[PDB]
Design a protein around this ligand. Sequence first.
Ligand SMILES: O=C(O)CN(CCN(CC(=O)O)Cc1cccc(O)c1O)Cc1ccccc1O
Ligand SMILES: [Fe+3]
Length: 498
Amino acid sequence: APDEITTAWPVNVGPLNPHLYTPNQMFAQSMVYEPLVKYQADGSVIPWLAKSWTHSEDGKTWTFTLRDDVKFSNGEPFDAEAAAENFRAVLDNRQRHAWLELANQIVDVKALSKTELQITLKSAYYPFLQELALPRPFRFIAPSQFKNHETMNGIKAPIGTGPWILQESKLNQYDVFVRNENYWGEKPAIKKITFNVIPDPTTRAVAFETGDIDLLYGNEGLLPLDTFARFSQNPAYHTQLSQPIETVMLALNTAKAPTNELAVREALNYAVNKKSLIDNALYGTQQVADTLFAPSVPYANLGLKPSQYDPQKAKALLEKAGWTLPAGKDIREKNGQPLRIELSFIGTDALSKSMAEIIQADMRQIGADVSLIGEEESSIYARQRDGRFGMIFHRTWGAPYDPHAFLSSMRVPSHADFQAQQGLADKPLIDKEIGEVLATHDETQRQALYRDILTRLHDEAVYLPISYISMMVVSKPELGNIPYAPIATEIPFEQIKP
Ligand SMILES: O=C(O)CN(CCN(CC(=O)O)Cc1cccc(O)c1O)Cc1ccccc1O
Ligand SMILES: [Fe+3]
């Protein structure tokens, strides 16, 4: 049918518990569940399930006036009691939301009436509203669908207030969504969306070619980039490539030899020809990055100095630090130790592998021996949490997480960023400033704090920025132009209009 589309995803959508993480897929959570306030491209929020709000002070106390016409898809009312119950369900699982600072900040949530919801905070936390706009955890399921008055141990039916309803879900096969005919807002033009489960990139491309699917929408791993370029020239298809949404980079372990040495980290930051990496591995479809956050990111236009590809300077830095070439060898040594660094990545990911081979080659030219460790997903995530790496592939989180939520999470010990930064003498100071910047109201101090944090991270060469990557689209021409959502992980199916 013509108001029915078929697309694909590498895995199923999950149970669609609005308050939990893996294996729930964010974009699908955002299809079913809705926030109090909705994020926009300009960086503000607009009213959503909450039609208005006031704050005290000195903002520790916020009072939201909720809409009074909203129903969950099962007929039950959305009201302040329903909302307060959801905040309780999430904060009963507080430990698991450590990465998100609002979760440590909420002191209390209570329904003052049916339409009045009061939320009090530990301090005047500036990104309050943006964090409420996230896909998860602060979105609302029907409280009748809690299991014994909680969500952290599972839910019953995934009943949201959103424009889409999960119809059917078959493990390792497909997920089917259907339009909410009783939605409080704008009715979407599409009536039915089918997600076929296709874990392999080339298989996804083939499925589009044979006509089995109408739409692919994702990041740089969506399909092979050479196939994408070919598709963009094929008059029978439609393709798109957005403006960059986030950064892809290596994180270097400042706590582990030999990346513990500033001079070594600086040298590595001159070793990679990033344009060539991009033209070679990413088929020219992405942009070079010479900084943890692109100059376009809020608070991140700082005139930071790039380290341009310069093997001559890389070698000089290494020689000066005492990493010199022994007789007939190509690998530097210092104290008898070789300049050896492990680069760990997901071994099944062909793009990572490609990029890692290029990185390994470039670094060999300046006399560093990069050893490639490709392992399964769990092993890699286990490495990121324990600091068991020399270098790893990492990325930022895009809007609305960048830069505040990304820096926030640098303070959490079981994250890759904390671990990479562990060896820095000024790490306690940086973590303290991250805490300050999030609670500050003085705009000039806020800017000064971001500058100091990002500058120290740049100068200490914690990262090796690689590119700023884009969203991509392949579609049947009949679907028309495919819009992008403000939040990088969401897919605006509601806005597709054949
Ligand atoms: O990704 C992390 O470091 C931790 N996550 C917190 C930060 N997440 C936002 C989010 O997940 O809501 C940032 C995030 C941002 C964009 C895309 C993502 O896939 C993504 O995860 C939570 C998490 C826990 C357990 C398994 C997977 C997870 O993502
Ligand atoms: Fe996450």
